Amino acid sequence: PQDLEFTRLPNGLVIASLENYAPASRIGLFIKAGSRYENSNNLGTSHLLRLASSLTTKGASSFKITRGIEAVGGKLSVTSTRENMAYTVECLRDDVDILMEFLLNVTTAPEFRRWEVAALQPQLRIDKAVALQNPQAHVIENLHAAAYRNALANSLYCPDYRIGKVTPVELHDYVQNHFTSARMALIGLGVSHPVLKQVAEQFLNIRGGLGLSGAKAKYHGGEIREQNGDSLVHAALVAESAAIGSAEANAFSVLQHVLGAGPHVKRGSNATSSLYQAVAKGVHQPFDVSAFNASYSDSGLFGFYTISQAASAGDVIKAAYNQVKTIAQGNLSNPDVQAAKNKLKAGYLMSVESSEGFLDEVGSQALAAGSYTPPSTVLQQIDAVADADVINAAKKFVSGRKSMAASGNLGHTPFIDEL
């Protein structure tokens, strides 16, 4: 039906909505406070905080909400990241109100009680376990140390001695401090904007306080090497890319799909990707290659990450690394830019086409801007990127202090000094 309607309120909290004709009725809350606000003594907070949703509110007893949710057959959701912590909630068209109420008391009416609090420690390791299977997971965090110093490098996962370290009082401060009506952004989907707007300012207006932004994160070069006995090494190399919200990050976001490929054909040796081909040509049999780009508010990180064998490691590196130079030499195929756009646009769409993916992308704007760019203009923006743009952008990559992280047998592994 009608498209995005977002109403700026006095509380600074933007309430956006549509209405659908669909039975799906969903809601989610997005807040700016992620890992990056955990200070040296605030560490792991979010990591554990995110795990609290099952506790007893001041509104409701924990047991209640439990038998509360399943009785509806509805569903609750929790999500965190380096930047935007978020809760997500969904149920059938009709009954959201009761659950809507529940969404309130959660962030509205916190309770911290030692027996309640402390007993949930053991969950952490069981948690912290499974993700660490994939070293690619394990690889990500250590990386952020190499590129920064203070905040962004902070893990999404509680440091180990930091585990017996978490008291209730700490939370409640961090609760209110980073929770304000200004920083809270709410999105509706298929429901009347008024019922949205009704409750909106009502419960959700509190303060004030603290967005405290003092982390510039100071992108800083360095590398880190950690030794395992694995037969398949993991290593990455990244240079600072631009901040989000410019064609520059898009230039890399172009430049990623230029070089980098999420697989478009299963089992296929990917020919249209030069690098992978440019690798296997001069290299030998199993390996895997991908270029990496991700950005945030105050910066972005663009590079490549490789997985090969022990001797394979250094070989892949320059073969991949010097391959990058070629485009940094002015080598380009403009039709590729189109195909990249073709890829870039479509892949973007195919991500946004899903409801929930779209759901995110909606409110992703919110804590960022507070407006909505139609995807059309976005697509127009995509075309807007010049060729030499990405080229010079690419030039920066090799043209600046680069960072490395090392996971695997290091036996043959070069340092940065070889690069």
Added chain:
Amino acid sequence: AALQPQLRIDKAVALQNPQAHVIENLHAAAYRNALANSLYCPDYRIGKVTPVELHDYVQNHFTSARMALIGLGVSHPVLKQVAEQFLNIRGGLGLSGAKAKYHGGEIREQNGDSLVHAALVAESAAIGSAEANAFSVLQHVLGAGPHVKRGSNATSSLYQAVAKGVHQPFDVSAFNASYSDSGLFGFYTISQAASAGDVIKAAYNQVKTIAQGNLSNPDVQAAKNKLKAGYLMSVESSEGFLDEVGSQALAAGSYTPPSTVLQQIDAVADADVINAAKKFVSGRKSMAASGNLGHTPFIDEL
């Protein structure tokens, strides 16, 4: 295989003292290949050790050429009798391909401790020259093993040069150790969280002063006085002497009388240690970080 469990129990106790824990990580920052290798089995490396591996490494690095035997109070012949007898095998020997390639870098590891540990070292010379001795002079110049218990050590400038511009408990020592193909000279500090960076330059820039040509020649003597005596008081013990005997053996194969050694000690010129000291600040330096890093600067602040 049954002796695996001993390892952790072993590997445990030493790791109490972070100063222990500090040493090894350090060697990573200054090198790449060999010297940085720990004296302690890496963790996944534990279930990793088969017999066959050993026996190769047994014979490979074991040769009559590389084996050096010392007697003490016993007839040289009974020594010499059995000597060539059993101990003559091969050969094979000695596989020296590690130059260790001193290489700059730093490493930072985060704990929750209230007392930080950090060190800064520049490459010093190889053992077996007055140059390493110049640092070995320069250590006892700046650095002090305590000669008075409980004493705030005045004759050490740095420690005083620290506490003068700094505050409440801390501890300061300069570090030097060498080997065949190189040596490592620097200082290592333990202070509080805010105390950390403060101590650093206050200590670090203090070093510059001597690198500025500032020197007191009588101190050199006292240093020698210290250096000679302390050396002696180490060598005076039998076993300490026992080591120092055969320490020569795998090194040289001769014996320098301590007299000439003492003469060698005097032989060091003043500007020698000065320029040697100059190198220290004058070259790529390495760092390792143990403690709360909250205030901890990087090398870039230094």
Added chain:
Amino acid sequence: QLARNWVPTASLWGAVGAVGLVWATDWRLILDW
């Protein structure tokens, strides 16, 4: 709770009890054949 089933099964057992319950004791009764 208005337990629904097992109500019929209940009648059975006491009855399953009941019939044999005389089949032990054996006394004045009706049908022979």
Added chain:
Amino acid sequence: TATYAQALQSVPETQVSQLDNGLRVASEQSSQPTCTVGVWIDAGSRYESEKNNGAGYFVEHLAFKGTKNRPGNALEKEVESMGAHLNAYSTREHTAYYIKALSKDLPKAVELLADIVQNCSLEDSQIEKERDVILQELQENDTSMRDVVFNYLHATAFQGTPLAQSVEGPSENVRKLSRADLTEYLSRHYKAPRMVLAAAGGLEHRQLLDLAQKHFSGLSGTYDEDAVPTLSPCRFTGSQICHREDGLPLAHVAIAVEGPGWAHPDNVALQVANAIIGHYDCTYGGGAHLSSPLASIAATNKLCQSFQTFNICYADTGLLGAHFVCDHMSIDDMMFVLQGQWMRLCTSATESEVLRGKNLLRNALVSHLDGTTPVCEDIGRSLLTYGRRIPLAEWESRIAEVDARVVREVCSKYFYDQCPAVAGFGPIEQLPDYNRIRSGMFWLRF
């Protein structure tokens, strides 16, 4: 507006269109720049002979290795030059070919898709590559105990029919296959009715049917005989399988009994049957307060690291049971405490407890519909299963059917005093012996 009552009314419906040689056309409009085109094939592993086993699998790989008209890896570049994602998959019954794409490049898609559907470049260049690649995989596939344990279960009951056999078949035919059999099995089973075609996106129907038309009006894709439609009732065997190995930490164990075919009313009730038990695993935020009896209790003592349930209904067959993971010394617990959660249903069960599950399955199917592709996939199986049927609102009606008696009628059939089969993998060791389970299925009323 949107009301869950109204929302059942406003739908783009599935479309029906026929070709002459047996291919079916169908479609739905998403008012969307993108569309998911796919092709479904009912050729089952159970059609292939024992020697033919693993072929289609091997074959599926061969498709995008370049086709008769379009040799190797000029194919991908185009779809990549387009920017479209491309994927395919297999199943003992069914093999899939599909693409996510914009509605713009649609025209080539079919004529690209169509070519490879039957026309195939057949060259021994790949035959050894894939064989080695497959021999690589076959030996690598031993890594996940999960996919391991399944096949055992099929062979357990379904021994005697091709249904139980591996998708990928014996390692030996992997070496032993000539592409004659391929072409031969290419030959038999790829003519219609076997073929089924659909797609979904902003496309409606007509503008599909025009550019459906002539290939693949068509290339035939035929219908003659190739027997008909050959399948047979598969044997349902009460039995056990035990592979005892003491090295690994845990033992994947699951349990099952046979069930009805795809199409049947009972197919509905069973959906809510598993809605009752729920499922627990390590890292759920569940905690002790969960409503499901085992989800709370089997977590309480962590009698399981994890468990779930499964339901699959074949043509003439169906499967019921749960799949669970726990430490070995306690394994006995789950088994003891799993059963009653069936049995107590069979007598004492309750209306309200179903509501949530009644609600859940309602909650379940609704959420199934996000994104382009999922609808596309539905159509194919639906056609292969119930045909045209998308009884969308009718589902609820099918759900509204449900009653406490209705349930306590259902489980009466397939559970109380039946013959289960046993699938297990080391460290099985403490697994209660068979004859317990059997005399353990039916209560004595205790």
Added chain:
Amino acid sequence: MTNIRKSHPLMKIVNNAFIDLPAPSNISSWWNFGSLLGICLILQILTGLFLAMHY
């Protein structure tokens, strides 16, 4: 042993010296005897007992 009627009275935990007593596969009838023995002992106990009454 969740809600197992073995542990509810502590007594029946002892009763698990039997149910779950592991046992060898190949066993002659010649291993019936051990259990067979106690049988006679019981049946006896009653007989001489009621006999003991009138004697």
Added chain:
Amino acid sequence: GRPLVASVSLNVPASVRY
């Protein structure tokens, strides 16, 4: 590569992503 990643806990289900 990865998003980079994400974290998911919530109530009844869960997983990790990239």
Added chain:
Amino acid sequence: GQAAGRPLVASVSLNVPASVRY
């Protein structure tokens, strides 16, 4: 950094528990 009588640290075990050093 503690050596000061000598070069760096130690490893010894024979009997007596174990010894680290400067």
Added chain:
Amino acid sequence: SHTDIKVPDFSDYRRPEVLDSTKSSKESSEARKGFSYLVTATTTVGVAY
């Protein structure tokens, strides 16, 4: 690998009613069971006497 296994055949011990695999096991199943139980019930009775 794992794949090469196939269950060996016991059928000698079976009875032919289910010997056809193209029978659904459910059909004989109906009458199939009771005869087994029939003994069970049957065997039980005389004991009580």
